[PDB]
Design an enzyme around this catalytic site. Structure first.
Site, PDB file in Angstrom:
ATOM      1  N   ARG A  45       0.841  -1.195   0.000  1.00  0.00           N
ATOM      2  CA  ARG A  45       0.000   0.000   0.000  1.00  0.00           C
ATOM      3  C   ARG A  45       0.882   1.254   0.000  1.00  0.00           C
ATOM      4  NH1 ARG A  45      -2.856  -0.302   5.447  1.00  0.00           N
ATOM      5  NH2 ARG A  45      -4.629   0.965   4.758  1.00  0.00           N
ATOM      6  N   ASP A  52       4.706  -5.203  11.064  1.00  0.00           N
ATOM      7  CA  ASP A  52       3.339  -4.924  11.474  1.00  0.00           C
ATOM      8  C   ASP A  52       2.417  -5.419  10.376  1.00  0.00           C
ATOM      9  OD1 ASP A  52       1.414  -3.901  13.296  1.00  0.00           O
ATOM     10  OD2 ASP A  52       1.189  -2.102  12.069  1.00  0.00           O
ATOM     11  N   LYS A  57       4.653  -7.973  15.520  1.00  0.00           N
ATOM     12  CA  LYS A  57       3.233  -7.924  15.869  1.00  0.00           C
ATOM     13  C   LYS A  57       2.954  -9.314  16.454  1.00  0.00           C
ATOM     14  CE  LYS A  57      -1.018  -7.142  13.194  1.00  0.00           C
ATOM     15  NZ  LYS A  57      -1.139  -5.681  13.357  1.00  0.00           N
ATOM     16  N   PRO A  77      -3.614 -16.736  18.546  1.00  0.00           N
ATOM     17  CA  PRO A  77      -4.905 -17.147  17.977  1.00  0.00           C
ATOM     18  C   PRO A  77      -5.862 -17.538  19.107  1.00  0.00           C
ATOM     19  CG  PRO A  77      -3.146 -17.942  16.614  1.00  0.00           C
ATOM     20  CD  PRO A  77      -2.503 -17.447  17.890  1.00  0.00           C
ATOM     21  N   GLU A 132      -3.539  -8.044  21.426  1.00  0.00           N
ATOM     22  CA  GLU A 132      -2.262  -7.873  20.719  1.00  0.00           C
ATOM     23  C   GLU A 132      -1.170  -7.204  21.557  1.00  0.00           C
ATOM     24  OE1 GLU A 132      -1.792  -5.865  16.547  1.00  0.00           O
ATOM     25  OE2 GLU A 132      -1.132  -4.489  18.127  1.00  0.00           O
TER      26      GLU A 132
END
Ligand SMILES: Nc1ncnc2c1ncn2[C@@H]1O[C@H](CSCC[C@H](N)C(=O)O)[C@@H](O)[C@H]1O
Ligand SMILES: Cn1c[n+](C)c2c1NC(N)N[C@H]2O
EC number: 2.1.1.57
Length: 291
Positions: A97, A138, A169, A173, A201
């Site tokens: 991005r 990240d 990061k 789960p 997190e």
């Protein structure tokens, strides 16, 4: 109101001294109270990590490879902070991005528009050579399958890049969505003030010594523990008003932020830690455009 006196905030996961059964209903509750809270969360954690490396003398002269950096608005402040301090750092921000334009036109920061894969990590390792590398990841694909995939990529980043330190990061789960046990690098599980309200997190901080790589196995029982500990942290702890904390904002997250910010290095000499922190916090909030 929820008032309390605390000596210090929980800085790492292992410090959390209690647990609570996770209540799925909390997922419907407001996740963020501040505008650009995500950039702030990242900025505090990364400033904390990088200041530690400075403290150990391994920041100056390194190239910081940040994967999953876009938009990366907060990265401009991080870059300015160490750049104004005199520390010499090259930044290589890689993401598929686009990055925030405020990152453009800086000779010490290179932006790369590419999603990284194992092959690419090898080419950049050949190209960065012989610089010392500091990894910050990240990346975000989610499903447990997506997570394992991301974690598998982060381990490959470390094996190929072979950095002197890494910030990764890390969100375990959920137990009710287990697939398989896996390994993550050994590191300090740094807690994050200003994380979403019920976020589990954290950031895994590691410094590599010698030529060894220590990993640690994560099982569904660990996942149940992560779930209960982070649930207690979010539901109870982070909703505490630290009355003995003499500061403009006495909420737990500002108390936690203060502790991370007191380790940051500044040029200006302050009569107290309170003065430094107020200064950095003000500077930070101003930059991010947070009231
Ligand atoms: N293999 C990969 N390589 C690079 N970036 C990846 C990736 N897989 C996901 N990403 C990126 O991971 C990002 C997650 S959000 C990252 C926010 C950024 N750290 C900031 O400071 O604002 C997205 O930008 C996504 O494109
Ligand atoms: C959906 N969410 C969100 N959330 C944080 C959790 C969830 N599911 C879980 N099984 N456990 C959790 O800790």
């Amino acid at each position: 109101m929820d008032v309390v006196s605390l000596d210090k905030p929980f800085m790492y996961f292992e410090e959390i001294d209690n647990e609570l059964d996770y209540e799925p209903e909390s997922a419907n509750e407001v996740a963020k109270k501040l505008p650009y809270q995500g950039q702030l969360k990242l900025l505090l954690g990364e400033l904390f990590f990088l200041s530690k490396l400075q403290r150990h003398g391994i920041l100056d002269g390194a190239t910081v490879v940040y994967i999953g950096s876009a938009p990366g608005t907060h990265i401009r402040y991080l870059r300015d902070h160490f750049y104004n301090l005199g520390v010499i750092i090259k930044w290589m921000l890689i993401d598929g991005r686009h990055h925030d334009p405020i990152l453009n036109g800086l000779r010490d920061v290179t932006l790369v528009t590419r999603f990284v894969d194992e092959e690419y990590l090898r080419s950049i390792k050949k190209q960065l050579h012989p610089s010392k590398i500091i990894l910050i990841s990240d990346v975000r694909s989610p499903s447990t399958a997506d997570l394992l995939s991301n974690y598998a990529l982060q381990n490959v980043m470390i094996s190929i890049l072979n950095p002197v330190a890494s910030s990764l990061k890390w969100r375990c789960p959920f137990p009710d969505q287990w697939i398989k046990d896996f390994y993550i690098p050994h590191g300090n599980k740094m807690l994050q003030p200003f994380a979403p309200s019920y976020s589990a997190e954290m950031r895994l901080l590691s410094i590599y010594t010698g030529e060894n790589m220590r990993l640690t196995r994560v099982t569904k029982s660990d996942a149940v523990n992560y779930e209960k500990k982070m649930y207690y942290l979010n539901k109870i702890v982070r909703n505490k008003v630290v009355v003995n904390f003499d500061y403009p904002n006495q909420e737990y997250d500002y108390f936690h932020m203060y502790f991370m910010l007191r380790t940051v290095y500044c040029n200006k000499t302050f009569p107290t830690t309170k003065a430094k922190v107020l200064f950095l916090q003000q500077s930070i909030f101003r930059f991010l455009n947070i009231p």
